[PDB]
Amino acid sequence: RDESDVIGKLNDMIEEQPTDIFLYVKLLKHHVSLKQWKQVYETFDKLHDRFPLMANIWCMRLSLEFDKELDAAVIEPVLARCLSKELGNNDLSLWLSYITYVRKKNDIITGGEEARNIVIQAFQVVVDKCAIFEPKSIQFWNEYLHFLEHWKPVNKFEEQQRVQYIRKLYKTLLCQPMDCLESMWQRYTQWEQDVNQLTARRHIGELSAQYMNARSLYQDWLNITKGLKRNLPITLNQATESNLPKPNEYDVQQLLIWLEWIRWESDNKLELSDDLHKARMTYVYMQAAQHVCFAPEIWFNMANYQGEKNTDSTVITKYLKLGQQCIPNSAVLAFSLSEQYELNTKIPEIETTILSCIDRIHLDLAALMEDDPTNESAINQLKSKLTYVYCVYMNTMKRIQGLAASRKIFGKCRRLKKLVTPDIYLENAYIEYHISKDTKTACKVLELGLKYFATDGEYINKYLDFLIYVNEESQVKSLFESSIDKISDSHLLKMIFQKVIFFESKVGSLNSVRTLEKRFFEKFPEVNKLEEFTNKYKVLDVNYLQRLELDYM
Amino acid sequence: RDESDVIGKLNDMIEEQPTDIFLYVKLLKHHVSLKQWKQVYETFDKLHDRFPLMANIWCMRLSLEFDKELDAAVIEPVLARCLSKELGNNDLSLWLSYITYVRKKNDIITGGEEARNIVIQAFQVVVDKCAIFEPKSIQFWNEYLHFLEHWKPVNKFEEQQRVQYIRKLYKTLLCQPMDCLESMWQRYTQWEQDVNQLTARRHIGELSAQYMNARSLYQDWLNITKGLKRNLPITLNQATESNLPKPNEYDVQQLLIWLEWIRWESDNKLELSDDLHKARMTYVYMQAAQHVCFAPEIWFNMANYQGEKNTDSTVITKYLKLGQQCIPNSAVLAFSLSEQYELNTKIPEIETTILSCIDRIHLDLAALMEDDPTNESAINQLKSKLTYVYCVYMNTMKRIQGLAASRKIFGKCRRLKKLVTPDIYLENAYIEYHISKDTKTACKVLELGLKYFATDGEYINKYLDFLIYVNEESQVKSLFESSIDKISDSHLLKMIFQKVIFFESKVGSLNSVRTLEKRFFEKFPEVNKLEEFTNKYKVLDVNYLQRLELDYM
């Protein structure tokens, strides 16, 4: 409960959903309008720490600085961070901002020789790292050709150097699948018959084939990439609630396109070297991790792809962790991280990363129960998710630290009462039963779960399976007899009667079997007697009476 | 190896397939042509003992006698047997033969008073037991009306008695669904306005409604009964290989019609009394048991229907046993009989009836393996059937007589080598494991089965399930590692890799899990990594990662 201090309410919301980028954007517009730059930079740093590879966000910080000469004391540290070697962003909009700053900082008119070379070095690094990969790159290539073309060769060396860069620019670009291809080739052909009428024919002719290939490959990309959307805002003011993903959200259709683009590249149709193919794949993965950033599959496929190639036992962990920063409630990434930590003997990290996911889910569940308390289905899914992760967590700690640890974990779930689901009880009975094949402790856990779930046909079903599985004959019939009028909707109830009857027939009585059948034909008239008799005599789950004798059934 | 004595070869074939009626027919035509009547009667008695309720066969014996005056010393004992109270046939062709003999034996011209009454008593017993039930009965009714109509009333009593029988005949027949309805009603209306013009109107009018009902009910019967076939031969010479079923054979389409006719009658649409409804149902059941005599379902439904109604703990056993005489290799009837014997404390009968089925299957299997040795699929089904019945037999004797008995039974299957199937081994390991939850004895049974089935993906699959189920961690991986190149066609192999990986992940190693995965991605490229990761983390058979997090999968 704050008063009427916007900054306080904003940070509270951010704290609740630290992955909701629009919330930071709002807090940033607010600090910017009040000119409180220390907080603006503090707010951005919070974003960068969590979303290091979201190039669009870095574009927002740089653009904010450009709009107000160019102070290098502020801009270079930022460029150094976002273009660093370990957390290196590789996005055309960010590179275009990079080039823009290099150009403004190295005046070609007033700096001559060294200047042109620095700028040209800039363009070439954008070329080698990104432009030969991104097919929607015409703005970049155009800007670089025009720069080289606009160069006034002073002396004879510069003159020879210019024609070289220009021919290097063309040969590089015209070989990859791109959107400027048809047009860049008209300018290349006119240009070769301009620099030398003798050599045109064989220069134009030495590319020719690779250019047709590039053009057809670009067509396939166009087909695959059909409705691909890339509209993340690159400026603070252009950010809206709509062009930024809400926590955990991603358009599955968009995800499928990224995965297909990546699948089309995994093939190395351009026949690049090992290192260039890897760089091309990496560029596309990073493009996807940026646009469907909340899709666990993209981070999972990326981390494994990176770690595949070469050694460095840290690589897979690195990308899974970036992914978890984006989706902290992701069980896929928590379990993946868990495997890597265990693989690298970072045992403490195993429990810590699992608890992290568990705590984030607990926050989602409490928020969902208070915010839309009537949404019974979403509340039930979340309870299930929470329970599931406690299950894997319990099984994992039993295996890694022993019975006493799994017991404490089960205790915490027992105290959450009906916040959790039946599964944690069933999974705990199995852990208890397998210590020495004793039934006492386990049966008590399941009896205790009955206090909360006796009305749950699904719990009763699996509880019966555990009893059969542990072979506690008398209990099987007891639980059933006692659950018959408690179980929700037939389907499971029909299926359970069959489970019990079959078991009791394997363990005689016949009188038991017979009455259990009487009530069965009472609760479910219209059930074919012979068909049910045939089910009762299954061996290893195969209804042989039907298969070998009552074929028409 | 006989010489050239037909009687010897014939009896050998009969002995091999005692349910093949045409074989007896051939042996009967042969004894009849050589006039060896002692053997003819011996041959028929063999048939009657096995097929007591096959009315058509009794018709064959009677017809054979009629064709040659009428010797009562021979005919009445036969009529007494087939129309007896316990094994009573109720079929129009047999009743028509009965009436024919009563008529020939009680001359109405030369015997007057008592004669007519005896004959009329005959017709009425056919009427009460069969004709008010069988809708294809016009020949019968016609013969009885014509008899009464042809009666020359001598005095005034006979005159009044005649009009009474005739009106009783009409009121009985015109109320049931039959094929003579439309026509019998034209003769009834003309007849009432013939015996009394004053009373016609109200007699004709008191039936009227019931007659329309009967006519519409007959139409439904016609619809249900569409292609129903009833062509069993009623005479020796009319019998062919085609109008008599071959061992175990029945047209499933015919069976479905009988069951539907019976289902249409189970309703009591005619609103008959308890006793009359039961007699109507019984008549139709017996008609079915005669025409699809090798359908286990007809005997099974009949025995239970009969035993339902009233007490007499012997009724269900009675009909199941007739059914087993028709289909001795039927496991459905052997198991059904087994339950009744146990229910009635006839414990010895349990094992005897099961061994009976087992021995008959052994005879079928040996005959199938020698007679068409290339039919691998039919040989494999029969081996499976044999094994299945040994399985139920073993489980039943363990339960009824103990571990030593089930052990002897398993020993007999172990000595049949590859005549049996993997199932008997798996079912025996479970019996062994559940004595005291020890693994030693059971594991040895399965290792021994590996000597015959290591190449059987289905055995390996279930063997792995038993190991997981018994939690023998090291063996699970051993068996798998050792079965990978032995298992037939993927499908099961893919499924098994997943089974093992999941188990090993529940029981750590990660290194084990990891390599087991390496080989898995080697043997099955194109398997989605994330999807497989998601399977590895299932809890209680539910892929929660997919369900709660990777929904689009």
Swiss-Prot record, chains A, B:
Domain of life where this protein originates: Eukaryota
Localization of this protein: Nucleus; Cytoplasm
Recorded GO MF terms: mRNA binding
HAT repeats: 35-67, 70-104, 114-150, 161-194, 235-267, 276-308
Principal location listed in the UniProt entry: nucleus
GO CC aspect terms: cytoplasm; nucleus; protein-containing complex
GO biological process: mRNA 3'-end processing
UniProtKB keywords: Cytoplasm, mRNA processing, Nucleus, Repeat
Function text: Component of the cleavage factor IA (CFIA) complex, which is involved in the endonucleolytic cleavage during polyadenylation-dependent pre-mRNA 3'-end formation.
Name of the protein described by the UniProt record: mRNA 3'-end-processing protein RNA14
Organism in which the protein naturally occurs: Kluyveromyces lactis (strain ATCC 8585 / CBS 2359 / DSM 70799 / NBRC 1267 / NRRL Y-1140 / WM37) (Yeast)
Lineage start: Eukaryota, Fungi, Dikarya, Ascomycota, Saccharomycotina
